[model samples]
Structure formats: structure tokens, C-alpha cells
Target: TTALVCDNGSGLVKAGFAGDDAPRAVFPSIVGRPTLKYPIEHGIITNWDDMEKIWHHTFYNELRVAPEEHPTLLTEAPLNPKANREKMTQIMFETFNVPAMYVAIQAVLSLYASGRTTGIVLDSGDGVTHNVPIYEGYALPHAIMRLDLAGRDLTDYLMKILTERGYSFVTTAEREIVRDIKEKLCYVALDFENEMATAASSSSLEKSYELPDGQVITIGNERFRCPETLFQPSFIGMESAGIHETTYNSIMKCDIDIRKDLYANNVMSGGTTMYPGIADRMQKEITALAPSTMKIKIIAPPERKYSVWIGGSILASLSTFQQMWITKQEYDEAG
Candidate 1:
């Protein structure tokens, strides 16, 4: 009952006790000074000192837990370095003095959340997007696809065009508001081709929103065009294929028989994927290239923004997993 679960990403930290349905606290994984800095980057912690502070704040203030009283299940990314992993173990055991601990990759945990060990996880967040294939709780590291395109890219693009439309976001506060506009104002198109072709007429619909300064801006074409960049990054000026193609290429790299199973269990994760009709668009995109026999399923469970944490919560709380935690005695003996 005292076990803790943490999924700390580059953008946000999700923290909770095991057995809970969702994380108790989800906040920016940031330490602010001038511009605000992320302690973690890509899939690794770049600044251990800042990371330690962030962890302490989460444990003490956010979740209100005593580290020595509880074992911990920490989520990590696939590319984490051996030295970083070693430092993590020491921090949890020596400094925090947790009773026991286990560090698991995020992709594996996402599969656990699905109640299946074999599946494909397409997790796109603020910093990066990962398309990973998992079979029986293990990942195919070779086929794991990583893309630079994500939520931040969308916000950057919006800032570009909003300037063209007479909104200059030079200040930090105004520039930051672009994210709100992107999240609240954008939606993926069910048919990408049908959009943009029909625009500018009175019959064509437009959505409008009022800013803090009492200026109501009429939005047209920006909604579909922005999110389209996720599925089609060329619009955002990227040369690479979008989420659809990368996901296809990733599964295609798998063995032939397992490919069907991989397609049937495509799970979604991260906040960038929260846009409406995104799963439908993803399903449509993948189905076009996939075989007729393949099911081409896409699962976007509610509260998927914390999929990795939820999976950790579920697995760490299971009674059968009690003995699997690396005990403090064993840690001291091994050291």
C-alpha cells in the first residue's frame, strides 16, 4: 500500500502511489530561473542535480510521501545510458533511502496498461514522438521509431502564422499562450485531402476565440492545417514522413507473423495525441498501407496522457510483484 510510482518525462512529471487508477499529481517537469529549464532531455536526464530536486519536490510536496517508507517503481526511456541508470539506482537507495526500487522503460509500461504484453505503442508528447513495438513485455529496440515532430513543433508553427495575422508574441507570456491556442483550437482532419480545397466562402465555417485583451480573432484553415503537420510534417516544412508513415515503417520492420498482432494492438499515449478525431485519422492513414487481413486497431484509452504511470501503478500494486522489488538489503550487499 506504500509503494510509489513515477513517470517523469521531459515536459511533465506524473506521480502517484501504486493501486490508484491515475496519478495523484501531473505538473511541468521544470525548474524555473530565467527561461525555465528541463532537467531531462530526449530520453535521459541531462542534469542529475536538478532532477534530484524535481523528484524531491514531487515526493514531498506533490504526492506527500515518505521515501523510506515506500518502495518505488520509476519509469524511464529506452535510450537511457548505463551510467545514468546506475546514478538513478544510487539516488533512490542511498539518498532517498527508499525500501526497494525498480526502473522500467515507458513503452513496456504502456503495454502493461493495455492489459497485454504484445502490442505497438505510439507515444507522442511535447518533446518527441516514439513508435515502439513490444512483444510479451519486451521491446524491439531495433525497430523503435523516434520522430522529432510533436506538440512543441505545432506551437512554434502557430506562432509563425499568428505573427503574419497581426499577433506578435515576442514576450514570454504571449509566446506561451500559443500552446493554449493549439490545444483548444486544433483538430485533425478525417480526410486531409478534402480540407483546404474548400475554403474562404461564406458557406465555409470558421471558429473564433477572444484573447485576454478583448480582441476576438476569427480562425479559418488554421485548425486542420496545424494538426495536419503531425500526420504530414511537410506542411510544417519537415522532409521526413509523418506519424502515419513512421508507424507503418516501424511495424513493417517486425517479423511477418507478428506484424498482424502489432497492428491489432496499436496503443496511443501522450498529451499531443489528445486532439479530437486523431485516432480515427491515424486508423485511416495506417489502414491505407496495411494489408486487408490486418485489423489495424488503434486504442486511445481515457487518461492515456498518463498511460505509462497508470501501467506502473497497476503492475507495482499487484500482490504477485511484491517479491520482485530489489530490496534494500540486497542493494547494500550488491554494493
Candidate 2:
């Protein structure tokens, strides 16, 4: 039942042991580029290790995995914008001695967890939004498309506004801070214009956010509030369609038969949907735009975060899980 949930943007590698209550361990995905001590101060690489020639060979190489010598269930963003995938893969396969790999999108895996053999899977991650439909738990390639708009891009744009206003903060640092701010302070208002006016006029508001380096960020206005990113991604830098449009486009990519059954089995599972009124908003938009004859009902997962990881874990725990495995000996003999 051992399983791993890896995300490069959030710097997470959540690995769990077998059991109803599997013990889990998490580690930052980013690692030091130069292993040697005192080689370079703050020489951590966000993506892959540097190809620079430092001191030739090494006496030892550190193999850091969540749990030593365990096969990890790894998945990365379809848009691996950063060089994190290469380094990320190395850590899982070579460092951790993972027996075999089952690479997939978190969205598809989460839909699998929901036990929906056929449905649309929307995974809005840091860099891109993945809208995919599943048929018999397999990805419908023809019915897949990726929207470049995502949460990270939204935060970066917001941070840029601050930068122009005399705040010289890096996007990475500002992004984390903004996410904290967005979670606590940002939300979707039914009458957005009215809410904006109300928020602007309110001077009695007082909220402070804690940062990594013992810093507190205070917000007195909702000017920074940007939950509209899900609908209109121009708030960020990307020139892509909103989640609704992309989702519709992706779903329409499927055949008429699969599309006909889609409404009955539609499932939305992902971390981005954790917002207060996001589910309701999606429901309204999808229903309004979709055909009246079609019944659209979104099945939300218990914990969107572990939707995929838990599914893989549950599958691994089954006695027939071994049937899915192919041994190295078999590969070697076949080769």
C-alpha cells in the first residue's frame, strides 16, 4: 500500500506506508545543487542540478527519499515549466530505488479515486490547468487540452503589482505569501462589483499574515483579492481561456457517446477547487452553458488534496495489486 504524492511547485513529496492509517512523510522537492559543504552559499536548485564541473568525483552521494528504499507513486504537472521533472524523477527512481513507475496526471488519478470509470478530470495546478476526460479509467487523449492559466501565474501577476509599488520581492517569495493571503483574505462575491465597492470603502479591516523570515504582511483592502483567476485568467499574464471554457472545450473533445454519459458521471477533484464558492460557481456555469437535456452533477471528493494519492494507495493495498506489477527480472529477461 506504499504510495507517494509528489508536487514540484509546492515542494512536497508525501509518501505513505501500508494500512488504514498509513504513516506518511513529506520532504521538500528542491535540493542543493552542489552536495559538498561550503561549495556555494544557498546553492539550492529549484529545477535540475547544475551541470557545472565542481570537484570531480564524490566520496558519497546523498540519496534522500521520503522513506528509504520504497517505491514512490510519482506524478508531475503536464506542463513541467521548471526543470524540476528531471531532478524530481532522479530522486524517485535512482535515489529511492522505486521498483516501477506509473506516471499519470493528478486529475485523472483523482477521478480514478472517485471510482468513476468515465468522466472529466480537472486538475488546476501551479503552472497549467489540465482538463481531461476518462474512459474506463483511461485518459481520453482526443478529449484532452491544457490551459496555461493556473494559480501560480495569478500570484505572480499580483506580486508584480506590489513590486511596481516599491516592493522589491521575488515572485517565488511573494507567491507563497500571496497564497496565504488569498486563502485567508480572498473569495468570490456574488455581486463582484458591489463587493469591490464595499471592500474599498472599509477602513476598519485589520488582518496580518506571517511570512517565513519572521515577517508579518498586513492587508486592509481586498484590492489584492483575485479569485476571478479561475474565470478570467487575464488577471494573470497568460492569454488563455478560463477554467470553464477550457473544461467545456476538453469535454467536447470526446465522442458523442462518451459526451452523452459525461453529465451523469462528471467529477471535480483537485486542490484548487477548495475555495468557498468555487464548486457552486462551477455548477452554475456548467449547467447554464451545457445542454438542457444533459444532466450535469459534479461529484466532489472528500479531501481533494489526497484524492489521487489515496486512490493509488487503495489500489496498492488490494491483493490483486501485485498483478499490476512487472518485476525487473522480467524486464531484464525480456530485454
Candidate 3:
């Protein structure tokens, strides 16, 4: 039987077969709702009917597969609610009629993707940024820290900046276009003050992005400013620690003996981490905070944006992974 891998991220869903290097289908996690005119929030599936609709659309329409023909591996965020997991398991077994299913924590899968059993994972996605410390394949829940600041915040900030400059976008479709512009143009600033001046003076730092309506917008400081939030959340008015401080504190919270390994094997996963110069700036900031005797390393693979899904694919394809699946009969017997 084939194994299907799905990484349900806050911003996007990545789904595909086990052997593929990347996901075949990727789409926004936000679903259209009748009550609210706009698309709702990320990852969490509040309505079973809507969730079922999404899964069916993803499976049959996108993947062109019968759910019953495959054993599936699904990725969930760290510290996911127990009720949500139970609901997901029920959906996979009863609704989709999958042969078997295994729900894996995203952070562990990220570590697995990096070929490491122990490390501190810094993940910044659509809704939240998490610092998860893993040891020998298990996540240390107590040490994990989550910040409310993430990609969505940046997108909103970019929109605000643009609107203040008299750029008007009419539809929800236009919002999505702005989102793409942010992703394509934004990058973390190595030196915020110097980069700010350069952004003001340097014509090279600016680019003209044409909207779907053929309206052209010039992007300058917003390019670096949006991503700068990852390093300085205070800049965006959020009273929270940045990714650097969060990573350092997360590793420090771990056992003293393992702190070195955690620091050395710092793995970055998620879409927000894809901003250019982000990893470099993180390394620089984190290194300054580390003890002089210790050396810190940041591992950011080129495919880190889809790390969770790739990790799920790698895990699902394993020969030993078959035994780890929860069969329909097992779920029925347990209930």
C-alpha cells in the first residue's frame, strides 16, 4: 500500500506521496466561510464539515487518489490540543477510511528532516513562531516557547505600510497579491540602521511590483522592514522576545549537559525562515548571546520552507514505519 504525507501548516498545506522530494499540492490553510466574508484563520479546523470538505478536495481533486488505498502520515504543531488530535484521527479512520494513520509532531519531523535526533528548532510560520527543543527524537514541551508574531503579522504590517502610502487594494484577491509581493521582495536586514539609510538612498534596493490590476507599486524600505520583525518584534509593537533570544533561552532551559548539542544543531524550519539573510542575521544575533567558550550553528536547508512535509515523507517511506501506524481496527478496539 502507498503512504500519503501531509503537513498541515498554519499558512499552507503540503501534501504528496512518500517518494517525492517535495509536496505535489500546496494551498492556503484558510478556508472560505459563509458567516465571515473573509477567509478565516490558519491551521486549526474549527468546523468538521469544512475540514472534511478541504481534505476531500485535497485528496481527490488535487492528489487524484482514493484515501482508502493509503496509510497516511499527518504532521501537527507542537503542543496540539488533545481534542484536535482525537478529531483528526476519527476523521482519517472513519470519514476517509484510510488503512492506517500516524500523527507526528512537526518539530520532531523537522529535526528528522535535518538528520538529527537532538536540537533546538526555530520555526516561524503563518500564525506563530515556536522554539522547540528536541532530545533523541522527543520534544521537551516545558522548554518550548511560542510567540504570537509570525508571517501573518509581517503581511499585515506590509499592507499597513502600503496603505499608509496611499496604495489601495480593493478585494481579498488583492490581499493575496500583496502577500505574494511581500514574500518575493522581503528580506531580513543585517544592519537595520544602515540598511534603512541605504533603502532610502539606493535605487537598487527598490523594485516595481505590478499588481493583478496592472497597478505598479514601488517597494523600498518595506522589503527589509517586514522581515526585521523576526529579529525585533518590538519594532512592530509586540512585547515579545525575538527569535534569537527565544532560541538562546530555549536551549538554556534544556539540561546543561545537552545545551551544547542543542546550540550546535539549531535547525530552522517554516516559511518565514525563507526570507533572505534571515539565517545569517539569526546566527549573528544568537552568537553574540552565547558564551564565549561555546560555538553556535544554525542549520537551514534550502528546502526548509517545506521541511515538515519532507520529513513526513521521509518517515512514512521507512520500512519500520509500517509498525508505527494506528490501524482502523486498533482505533475501533481502543474506543
Candidate 4:
């Protein structure tokens, strides 16, 4: 059986094999060093851990690493530059000792979990947005579309506003800080137009929240608002399209039969969909885009983030899949 899967991130790494509790381990992807004259040190957690407190003059350390400690697998972002993708591939095969590797977007794996013959997979993660089309357990390459906006970009914007308001926290740390904010502050407005009007008002823009640490986070300030970003991605120069339209465009690329059958099983599984009103908003958007007679819907697992891992777990338990794996005898024969 495969021993581990490593969902490496710019900020953290989730490592463990199928069916293992939690990830076998996790570490931040960042490595920092000081000036050229000091001793270098390395670690994952910064600020809160002792590792970040090493010599002040250290100048050298590398963040990129081979997944050599275990058999690691990761979901690669879509349309990653060929050189970068090849470099990662090489690291896995050469440095990590990977015998073979499967590279696909996380959303495609989620579709595999649902066992749907035809459907679109929409994934919104920290780094990018991906739409993958899967038919009968296989992904369709020509149908994929990717967007540059995601959690990291949003967090950066939020951190900038917070800094102006006297919060000196690092943008990197803002991910942890604002992930909670994104969960709490984000909502797909049912009356989005009206909510926009309200937020546009000077009085409404002054809304703020008092944090447990005694810092004040003004969420909808004169120029700082959440929904406005999704509608006008120019806030982050992410081109001009909101999630609803993009999600619709993603599904429309399928074959006639597949698109016709989409209503019954359109599944959305990702961290972003977990925001309170996203599914309803997505459903409404789909209805508006399609024929009036065609009713559309979006579904996500009870815990959307774990949906892909759960699907992988189920796949690992199947006898046919189990039989497909090579045993020690096969490896010995090849050797």
C-alpha cells in the first residue's frame, strides 16, 4: 500500500498516506535566513517557535525540498509552468525516490470520489482556482480552465488594509489570521446588489470587529470590503470575472450529453465553497445562466475540505484497485 501523500503548500505541508489519521505530519514551506555572516537555521513555525530565533546574521537556506522521507504525493496547481512542473516531477522521482506518480488537480480527485460519470470539478484553494472536467472517472484535459485569484491573494489585500489600521502583523501570518476572518466575515449575499449598496454607504463601511487579542479589525472600511473583491477582481488585477460566471463557463465546456445531465450531479467541493452562502449563490447563478426549464444545483460534502482525501481513502479500500498495485515480487522481478 502507498505510505503517504504530501499536500505541500507555500505556507504548510499536509503529509500522510490514505486512511492515516490527520496528516502523518505538517510543516511550513517557508525557510528564512539572515545576513551573510551568521549561522543558518531552519524551521516551519515562525514567531511562535524557537526555530525562528537562531543567529541574526544567517544568509542561506533553501525552502524547496524533495519528498524523500516518505512516499509523497501532491495535487499540483493547474497550468503550472512546464519548467516548474518538470522540476517538481524530477524532485519526486529523483530526490524523493518515487517509483511512479500521478499528477492531477484536487478537484478532479474529488470528482472521482463522487463516482460521477460526467460532471465539473471546481476547486478554490490558497493559490489558484481550477475547473476540471471528468467523464466516467477520467479527466478531460481540453476542458480545463484556471484562474489566478485565490485565498492567498485575498489575504494579502486584507493584510494591507489591516496594516494601515496599525496592525503590524506579517502578510505571511495574515493567512492564519485572515483564514478565520474569511470564514467568519465571508458570506454569499442573497441580495448581493442590496448588500453592495449598503457596503457602499459611508456609515456601513465603518464596520469593525474587536479581536480576542485586543486588536481591532475594521472589515468594511471606506475602501475595504469582501464581496466587492469577488465582483471586481481588479482589486487584485485578476481580470474581470466573478466566481459565478466562471463556474458556469467551466461546466458549459462538456459534451452535450454530459452538460444535459449536469443538473442532477453538479458537485462543488473545496474550501471556498464552505463559506456560508456560496452554494446557494452558485445555484442561483447557474439557474440564471441556463434554460429556465433546467434547474441546476451545487453540492458539497459535510466537510468540504476533506472531501478529496475521503475519496482517496475509499479508492484505496477497493479490491480491484488493490490488485492493480505492484507487490514485492513484481519489484524484485523488474530489478
lDDT of each: 0.85, 0.56, 0.84, 0.55
Candidate 4 shows a clash count of: 3
Candidate 4 least-lDDT 10 residues: 35-44
Which pairs clash (backbone N, Cα, C closer than 3 Å) in model 4?
Answer: 34-58, 38-57, 117-136
Q: Backbone clashes in each candidate structure, one number apiece?
A: 0, 0, 0, 3
User: Model 1 residue 330 lDDT?
Assistant: 90
Query: How many backbone overlaps does candidate 1 show?
Result: 0
Better of 2 and 4 by TM-score: 2
Residues 80-184 of candidate 1: C-alpha lDDT, one tens digit per residue: 677888899999999899889999888778888878889999888777888999887888888889888778788888777777767776675876677888888
Off by over 4 Å in 4: 21-27, 35-72, 79-90, 98-101, 115-117, 160-176, 198-208, 216-224, 323-335
Better of 1 and 2 by TM-score: 1
Pairs clashing within candidate 3: none
- The TM-score of candidate 4 is 0.72
Please, what's the RMSD in Å of model 4?
7.5
Name model 2 segments beyond 4 Å from true.
1-11, 18-23, 32-69, 76-101, 161-175, 200-225
What is candidate 1's TM-score against the reference? 0.94
- Encode model 2's per-residue lDDT on 1-335: one tens digit a residue: 25443322232334454343332544333335444222212112332332111101110122234333344455554433345444544443444445654444566667767877678877765445677788877787767777765555556655665565465558555667766666666555444566667657875544666777897766543433466777777766558887777778877878888886676666765555555667666776777778988887767765765666665666555576556653434433542
> What's every prediction's RMSD, in angstroms?
1.8, 6.4, 2.0, 7.5
In candidate 3 the C-alpha lDDT for residue 21 amounts to: 90
